[PDB]
Scaffold this active site. Structure first.
Site, PDB file in Angstrom:
ATOM      1  N   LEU A  29      -6.966   4.331  -3.549  1.00 15.00           N
ATOM      2  CA  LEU A  29      -7.014   5.281  -2.440  1.00 15.00           C
ATOM      3  C   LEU A  29      -5.850   5.084  -1.481  1.00 15.00           C
ATOM      4  O   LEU A  29      -5.249   6.049  -1.007  1.00 15.00           O
ATOM      5  CB  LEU A  29      -8.332   5.162  -1.678  1.00 15.00           C
ATOM      6  N   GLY A  30      -5.533   3.829  -1.191  1.00 18.41           N
ATOM      7  CA  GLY A  30      -4.488   3.529  -0.235  1.00 18.41           C
ATOM      8  C   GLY A  30      -4.265   2.045  -0.072  1.00 18.41           C
ATOM      9  O   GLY A  30      -4.946   1.219  -0.685  1.00 18.41           O
ATOM     10  N   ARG A  31      -3.299   1.708   0.768  1.00 18.79           N
ATOM     11  CA  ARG A  31      -2.934   0.324   0.995  1.00 18.79           C
ATOM     12  C   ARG A  31      -2.723   0.085   2.481  1.00 18.79           C
ATOM     13  O   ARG A  31      -1.861   0.700   3.107  1.00 18.79           O
ATOM     14  CB  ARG A  31      -1.674  -0.031   0.201  1.00 18.79           C
TER      15      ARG A  31
ATOM     16  N   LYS B 190      -2.301  -2.754   5.848  1.00 24.18           N
ATOM     17  CA  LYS B 190      -1.427  -3.871   6.147  1.00 24.18           C
ATOM     18  C   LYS B 190      -2.011  -5.142   5.547  1.00 24.18           C
ATOM     19  O   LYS B 190      -1.283  -6.071   5.199  1.00 24.18           O
ATOM     20  CB  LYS B 190      -1.254  -4.010   7.661  1.00 24.18           C
ATOM     21  N   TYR B 191      -3.333  -5.161   5.405  1.00 21.22           N
ATOM     22  CA  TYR B 191      -4.048  -6.371   5.018  1.00 21.22           C
ATOM     23  C   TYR B 191      -4.821  -6.244   3.704  1.00 21.22           C
ATOM     24  O   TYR B 191      -5.571  -7.149   3.336  1.00 21.22           O
ATOM     25  CB  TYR B 191      -5.023  -6.777   6.128  1.00 21.22           C
ATOM     26  N   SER B 192      -4.647  -5.130   3.000  1.00 16.45           N
ATOM     27  CA  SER B 192      -5.445  -4.897   1.803  1.00 16.45           C
ATOM     28  C   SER B 192      -5.143  -3.589   1.067  1.00 16.45           C
ATOM     29  O   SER B 192      -4.530  -2.671   1.611  1.00 16.45           O
ATOM     30  CB  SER B 192      -6.926  -4.924   2.176  1.00 16.45           C
ATOM     31  N   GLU B 193      -5.581  -3.527  -0.185  1.00 18.66           N
ATOM     32  CA  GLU B 193      -5.541  -2.300  -0.964  1.00 18.66           C
ATOM     33  C   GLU B 193      -6.963  -1.797  -1.159  1.00 18.66           C
ATOM     34  O   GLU B 193      -7.894  -2.585  -1.335  1.00 18.66           O
ATOM     35  CB  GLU B 193      -4.858  -2.523  -2.316  1.00 18.66           C
TER      36      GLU B 193
ATOM     37  N   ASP C 241     -10.249  -1.192  16.834  1.00 19.92           N
ATOM     38  CA  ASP C 241      -9.362  -0.292  16.098  1.00 19.92           C
ATOM     39  C   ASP C 241     -10.017   1.075  15.939  1.00 19.92           C
ATOM     40  O   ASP C 241      -9.994   1.683  14.866  1.00 19.92           O
ATOM     41  CB  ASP C 241      -9.000  -0.904  14.735  1.00 19.92           C
TER      42      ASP C 241
END
Length: 327
Positions: free
Chosen positions: A43-45, A47-50, A154
């Site tokens: 789905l996406g990536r 800063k800290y994970s995929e 966040d």
């Protein structure tokens, strides 16, 4: 030095907890079975994970898998403990499992699936009623986590998953969330630029749940005024100037003066002098149907420099803006 500050609500919740509740460093991860899950689509990536869409072959349920990067480590246990503490709460994303990914050799968090629609496309179509409805749902999540001694830190449209068809909402990505401890100094490098509270932008570290309420205010302003983002800074410094051009510089100075805070001297040349603007300024023919005296008063009580003066999540749920929402 700066004057200390404390939350006006849920101040001592963690002090009365067993160490285990907030001592995330000591938490022992309970691992599940990585082979239960088959990755389907990236789905996406972050800063800290995929992040992957996946399927739980032990029930054919669609899930979301967040595979954590070698992060700040211990940040892993923090997010895990917070998700477990909050699990089952109103509109809190459910952590379904924690497995060890064989390729990354890092923890992979397995979440409930939510059929969300891109906030951009969705914020183009929300009616007045739907803005109020979903704001109320977000507030349920925020009052819950605050009541549990946790600030999200966040809040932004990208972290609110909305399944419009079934009108359900989930607050996600608790990777920046923290336990609130009265008198604790926190990292001001949190939230996303456009949603950063004034406290972060002036480097005041002793902040609290009320950070999330500024962020929520930024979301509300973007929605009712159809302006994305509402405060459109080019960097973190310009971000405060953008805010000051609406809220005015006098109340900014009153704020930093209250907490005996000094502005970064690089603001000397860029901040200027600005009057507080009436919110009517931002109303026009294209957003007028989304605006009401109630909306403006509510927004006004969220977007305050002084974090101590903002509506708390529960107070916000009391506001006349939500009287029209079926409960």
């Amino acid at each position: 030095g700066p004057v200390p500050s404390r939350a006006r609500v849920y101040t001592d919740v963690n002090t009365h907890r067993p160490r285990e509740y907030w001592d995330y460093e000591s938490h022992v991860v309970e691992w599940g079975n990585q082979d239960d899950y088959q990755l389907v689509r990236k789905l996406g990536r972050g800063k800290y994970s995929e992040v992957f869409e996946a399927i739980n072959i032990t029930n054919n349920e669609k899930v979301v898998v967040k595979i954590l990067k070698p992060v700040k480590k211990k940040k892993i246990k923090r997010e895990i403990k917070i998700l477990e503490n909050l699990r089952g709460g109103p509109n809190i994303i459910t952590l379904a499992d924690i497995v060890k990914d064989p390729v990354s050799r890092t923890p992979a968090l397995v979440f409930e699936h939510v059929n969300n629609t891109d906030f951009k496309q969705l914020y183009q179509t929300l009616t007045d009623y739907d803005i109020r409805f979903y704001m109320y749902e977000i507030l349920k999540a925020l009052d819950y986590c605050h009541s549990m001694g946790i600030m999200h830190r966040d809040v932004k449209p990208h972290n609110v998953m909305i399944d419009h068809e079934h009108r359900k909402l989930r607050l996600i990505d608790w990777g920046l969330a923290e336990f609130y401890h009265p008198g604790q100094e926190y990292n001001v490098r949190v939230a996303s630029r456009y949603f950063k509270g004034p406290e972060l932008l002036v480097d005041y570290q002793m902040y609290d749940y009320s950070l999330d309420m500024w962020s929520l205010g930024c979301m509300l302003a973007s929605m009712i005024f159809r302006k994305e983002p509402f405060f459109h800074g080019h960097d973190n410094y310009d971000q405060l100037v953008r805010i000051a051009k609406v809220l005015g510089t006098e109340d900014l100075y009153d704020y930093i003066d209250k907490y005996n805070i000094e502005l970064d001297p690089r603001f000397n040349d860029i901040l200027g002098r600005h009057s507080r603007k009436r919110w009517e300024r931002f109303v026009h023919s294209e957003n007028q149907h989304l605006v009401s005296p109630e909306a403006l008063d509510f927004l006004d009580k969220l977007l305050r420099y002084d974090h101590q003066s903002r509506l708390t999540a529960r107070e916000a749920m009391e506001h006349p803006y939500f009287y029209t929402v079926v409960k």
